[PDB]
Design a protein around this nucleic acid. Structure first.
Ligand SMILES: [Mg+2]
Ligand SMILES: [Mg+2]
Ligand SMILES: [Mg+2]
Ligand SMILES: [Mg+2]
Ligand SMILES: [Mg+2]
Ligand SMILES: [Mg+2]
Ligand SMILES: [Mg+2]
Ligand SMILES: [Mg+2]
Ligand SMILES: [Mg+2]
Ligand SMILES: [Mg+2]
Ligand SMILES: [Mg+2]
Ligand SMILES: [Mg+2]
Ligand SMILES: [Mg+2]
Ligand SMILES: [Mg+2]
Ligand SMILES: [Mg+2]
Ligand SMILES: [Mg+2]
Ligand SMILES: [Mg+2]
Ligand SMILES: [Mg+2]
Ligand SMILES: [Mg+2]
Ligand SMILES: [Mg+2]
Lengths: 71, 62, 85, 82, 205, 80
RNA sequence: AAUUGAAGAGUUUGAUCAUGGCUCAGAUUGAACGCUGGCGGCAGGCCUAACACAUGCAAGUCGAACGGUAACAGGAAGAAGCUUGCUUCUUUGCUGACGAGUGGCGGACGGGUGAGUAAUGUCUGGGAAACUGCCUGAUGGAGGGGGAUAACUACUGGAAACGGUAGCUAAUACCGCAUAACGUCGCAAGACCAAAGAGGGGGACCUUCGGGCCUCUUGCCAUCGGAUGUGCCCAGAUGGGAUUAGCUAGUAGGUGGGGUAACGGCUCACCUAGGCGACGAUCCCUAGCUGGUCUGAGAGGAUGACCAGCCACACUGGAACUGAGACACGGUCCAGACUCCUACGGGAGGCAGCAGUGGGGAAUAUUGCACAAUGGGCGCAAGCCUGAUGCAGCCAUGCCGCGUGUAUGAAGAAGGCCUUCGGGUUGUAAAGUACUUUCAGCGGGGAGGAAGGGAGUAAAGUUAAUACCUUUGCUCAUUGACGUUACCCGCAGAAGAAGCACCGGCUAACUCCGUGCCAGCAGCCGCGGUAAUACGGAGGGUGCAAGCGUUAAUCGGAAUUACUGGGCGUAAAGCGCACGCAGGCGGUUUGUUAAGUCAGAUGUGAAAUCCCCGGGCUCAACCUGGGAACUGCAUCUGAUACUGGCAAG
């Protein structure tokens, strides 16, 4: 959804009370990828040879607005 | 310092983040820099086709 | 710091303490000789001189004073013990 | 102590050692006392391949210089055994 | 790297056949040689010293199919090498393998010959050579690989080749399809409306 | 031979410690003129053997004090 | 053979010439940004915050120095569930080996950084008063004793970091004693100084049958040499400022004590009153230096990344100890700033090592692989350690190759664009038809970087010995991270692979349309107010091409700081004028001198770079052999016209 590729490096699974390190991450699992450059929320990370956009949940859209000045 | 915003049309306003290029304007004394279209908050020129590298306009999907 | 070549620190402490007491003593004999020189007691000078020579000479070999210092001490002290004594 | 050894001067995947005498404590391609030849583990069976200024080696070996095991093998293979 | 654009047009700008379509007939025409290299090609633009100076070196480049950076390097080398820097430019230029392969008639056009060099379809002194810019020495022998020894292209290639004015500093065959760069070509035995001092002085200012 | 240097005295009273000036002509690094170049050295001469005005000969030597590494050897000319 | 190479143009005016600034064409970059993006080779990659740092790694290693057994194995001062010679428990340090401890060597190397440092450094050249582990050549020593201590053990404190008392033990730890010269002190007579053992094998002989004893290999002491490393001294050269002109008490010298490896106000007392400075001291500001790099015809200017040499620094300030070497990057102590752990009593730490984070920024990479090669630490060795190094990952950042096809193809299709509606152009381009298959892709095979180490066996090498130990042949197994390596051969199919800038003059390239001093362009002059080749689009064209532009930056052009190589009557420029110190310069003859100058000779000017000729990767970049070069410094010896000095005119 950005038409840019990323290179996975370190990977971590939050494991109750320890950020354990992993080298591989299979399907049906969740994790956090360290260091990924330009990945915002809702983006699909697929295989570059077999490319796909996924559904992407929805963005609740704000109900309250306010002006702020930097004191 | 003050800087030019070449090209037809632009966004840019009070809190925009931009990129200064250097380059004067022989019409605006004291203006000694250009704004670099298409870097940071400064969008490229709309619909420009010739010389798009300047004015930061990506190739119109051939 | 967490590198077992910290035992080096504990060793060199033992070393200082050793060198400490010896080099202390050595000096206190070189002190004795000048005591005569200052006192005028011409005999006491050679007495101690000949008493310190073995210390000083050994300490050069032991390598806690290294050679020419031992040389210099007895050297110029000779040059003083018989300049009136 | 001073030693005769190989300093890598080739290029990635195409080395070219330089036999040279130095204080062992210096860096490999660093400060040296004197160069004494080269060893080109490539070249093939061409015009050259190795060269040892054996007089100079032997000279330095005289003042208590030592030989790097790979240089030793190289000397004991440039012959000088008949 | 290669040019790739429409090739006759190039010739049409230079006002000469640079044999980019050596192929067969025409030797040009069925092109409208000169009188319109573009929409405005049909004019007589009186061009400045810098223009002809450009056009001329630009001519040489298109003939051999060599691009600026490499061609610069060819000039810089030519400069360094002893002798009239002007002519020994052409020397490196002429000594290019791809050029030699064309000059020996193994390929119809210089561009064609290049493709041949690229496809490992040519060897030198016993050894296979891929790169079109391989610098050929004297006594070197360029030969066609057996794997592709006389198939359709190279046949016709050697065919109309021999019907062309022929070389001197190298001897071809046609039976074994092999030849020898006998010696470096001298400036006398290659020319036309091609000067140098133009293209020499150009890179010197 | 003995690497030595001539040069006149200057400054007298210092107690076995004469100081000598050594002119030299040298070409200017860019413009080429030859220009004068004084060079003051702290010389030692045991038993104040000379004095101001004297063209003296000296040689380099062991350190004898802070800026003092040259001994007096001959003398040439003296009076005023 | 070998640094053999110098271009101008635009712009002041109505026009001209001159002057003079500004501007442009070239080359270069550790770059960035914008648009675009196929591969490979070699190379480069925090230029800013020497800003703070989570996490892992970056220094260990010897049982052939010592007491040793906790674990691992075998063997067991030898045994079960019985599965009788295959096991897994319990014991034994037996042997391999090895946690912790004493000891030894290393941790002062390797690697990072440019803060500090305008001369406590660096470059070139000289010099005398010094120490120097490991490696080495040589001469002799290697006798005989002694007191301890970690570990360990018994109590005992902590949350932890750490430990506390008491008792015992080994050594190549430690200390006497003997020995004592070609060593130190001394004129001499004389005085006086050291050390250590450990292993492999073995005929007899001997034995508490542990060994003694023999032999071989290592290690220890001492001294004089060598080699390498370092310390110290002098001279010249090494930024800007005078809107900084005075500076100076251990200041300058001497004497005598002390001091260091060593010379020395290095230190201390006394005595002289000096020492520095316009040839720029002092004080400010900036800066690590050189080899070299970039530019330049050169002379110059600019610069100090990558490689190598040198120096300095290791959170900040300061300090010593250990030691051959440190005033110690991953040591110690003290203070500071900061951060972290705490069971609140107390504790811990410094990525400018590699990788990586945060932060700053226009901007700079993976928390990878392997010790296989080279090289370093320890070790007899095997080996172990090694973020040095060798490789791989990431980024078009650069340089160099290569590709993204090749040929054929016309009344010259359509479409677009121009048109005086006759046509012209894009354009042989496309389509179509022959043809090829590099590189990518898929399958096979497959160099080289590997030389060595391990066993065996054969050699008056040894020795008492056919053992042990050393060398070398030969023989048999075997050692790569890269690695699906390079490269080779098969297979399919033009298939996966073109952009960016420009087209008023300088400046290579012209038209229509929109717009109408608007919207905008612009390096410079200047375009725009209705036929705009200058704005925006289009067609066409020129230039570069996996890059192209733009910006930033250095040199060039610039003879525009003019040494080479310029100027001042009116263009900017003669002080209003004289006298005069310092400095610069100096008529004419002889002799002498030999500083400058000249000539020749010898050391030297690191390597890499540049350049020449070759050689090696399919080519090139890249790598490499030898030379030339390094225009310099120093010294000795010469030459005597000119210059300078001295003598007489
Ligand atoms: Mg000490
Ligand atoms: Mg290219
Ligand atoms: Mg152990
Ligand atoms: Mg600095
Ligand atoms: Mg004794
Ligand atoms: Mg004294
Ligand atoms: Mg003294
Ligand atoms: Mg200049
Ligand atoms: Mg410090
Ligand atoms: Mg550290
Ligand atoms: Mg048409
Ligand atoms: Mg034009
Ligand atoms: Mg119009
Ligand atoms: Mg336009
Ligand atoms: Mg100039
Ligand atoms: Mg002027
Ligand atoms: Mg005037
Ligand atoms: Mg006047
Ligand atoms: Mg004279
Ligand atoms: Mg050189």
């Amino acid at each position: 959804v950005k038409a840019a590729r990323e290179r996975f490096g370190r990977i971590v699974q939050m494991h109750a009370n320890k950020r354990e390190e992993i080298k591989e991450v299979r399907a049906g699992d969740i994790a956090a990828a360290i260091g990924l450059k330009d990945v915002t929320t809702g983006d699909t990370l697929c295989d570059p040879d077999a490319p796909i956009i996924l559904e992407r949940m929805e963005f609740p859209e704000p109900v309250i607005s306010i002006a702020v000045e930097p004191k | 310092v003050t800087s030019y915003i070449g090209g037809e049309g632009h966004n840019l306003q009070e809190h925009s983040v931009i990129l200064i290029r250097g380059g004067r304007v022989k019409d605006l004394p004291g203006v000694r820099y250009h704004t670099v279209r298409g870097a940071l908050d400064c969008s490229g020129v709309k619909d420009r086709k010739q010389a798009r590298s300047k004015y930061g306009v990506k190739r119109p999907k051939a | 710091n967490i590198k077992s070549a910290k035992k080096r620190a504990i060793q060199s402490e033992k070393a200082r303490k050793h060198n400490a007491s010896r080099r202390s003593m050595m000096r206190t004999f070189i002190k004795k000789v000048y005591a005569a020189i200052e006192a005028g007691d011409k005999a006491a000078a050679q007495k101690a001189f000949n008493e310190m020579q073995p210390i000083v000479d050994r300490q050069a070999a032991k390598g806690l004073i290294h050679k020419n210092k031992a040389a210099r001490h007895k050297a110029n002290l000779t040059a003083q013990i018989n300049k009136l004594a | 102590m001073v030693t005769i050894r190989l300093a890598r001067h080739g290029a990635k995947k195409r080395p070219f050692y330089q036999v040279v005498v130095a204080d062992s404590r210096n860096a490999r391609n660093g400060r040296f006392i004197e160069r004494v030849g080269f060893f080109n583990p490539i070249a093939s069976e061409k015009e050259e391949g190795t060269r040892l200024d054996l007089d100079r080696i032997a000279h330095w070996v005289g003042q208590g210089a030592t030989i790097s095991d790979r240089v030793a093998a190289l000397i004991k293979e440039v012959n000088k055994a008949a | 790297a290669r040019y790739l654009g429409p090739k006759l047009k190039l010739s049409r700008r230079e006002g000469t056949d640079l044999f980019l379509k050596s192929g067969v007939r025409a030797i040009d025409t069925k092109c409208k040689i000169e009188q319109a290299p573009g929409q405005h090609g049909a004019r007589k633009p009186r061009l400045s010293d810098y223009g002809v100076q450009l056009r001329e070196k630009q001519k040489v480049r298109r003939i051999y199919g060599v691009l600026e950076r490499q061609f610069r390097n060819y000039y810089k080398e030519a400069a360094r090498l002893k002798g009239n820097t002007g002519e020994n430019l052409l020397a490196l230029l002429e000594g290019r393998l791809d050029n030699v392969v064309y000059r020996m008639g193994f390929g119809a056009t210089r561009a064609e010959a290049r493709q041949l060099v690229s496809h490992k379809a040519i060897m030198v002194n016993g050894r296979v050579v891929n790169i079109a810019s391989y610098q050929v020495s004297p006594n070197d022998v360029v030969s066609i690989r057996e794997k592709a020894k006389k198939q359709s292209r190279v046949k016709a290639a050697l065919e109309l080749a021999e019907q062309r004015e022929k070389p001197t500093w190298l001897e071809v065959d046609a039976g074994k399809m092999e030849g020898t760069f006998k010696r470096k070509p001298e400036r006398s035995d290659l020319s036309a409306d091609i000067n140098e001092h133009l293209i020499v002085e150009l890179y010197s200012k | 031979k003995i690497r030595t240097l001539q040069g006149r005295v200057v400054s007298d009273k210092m107690e076995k410690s004469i100081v000598v000036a050594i002119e030299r002509f040298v070409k200017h690094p860019i413009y080429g003129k030859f220009i004068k170049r004084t060079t003051k050295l702290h010389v030692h001469d045991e038993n104040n053997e000379c004095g101001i005005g004297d063209v003296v000969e000296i040689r380099e030597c062991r350190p004898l004090s802070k800026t003092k590494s040259w001994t007096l050897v001959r003398v040439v000319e003296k009076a005023v």
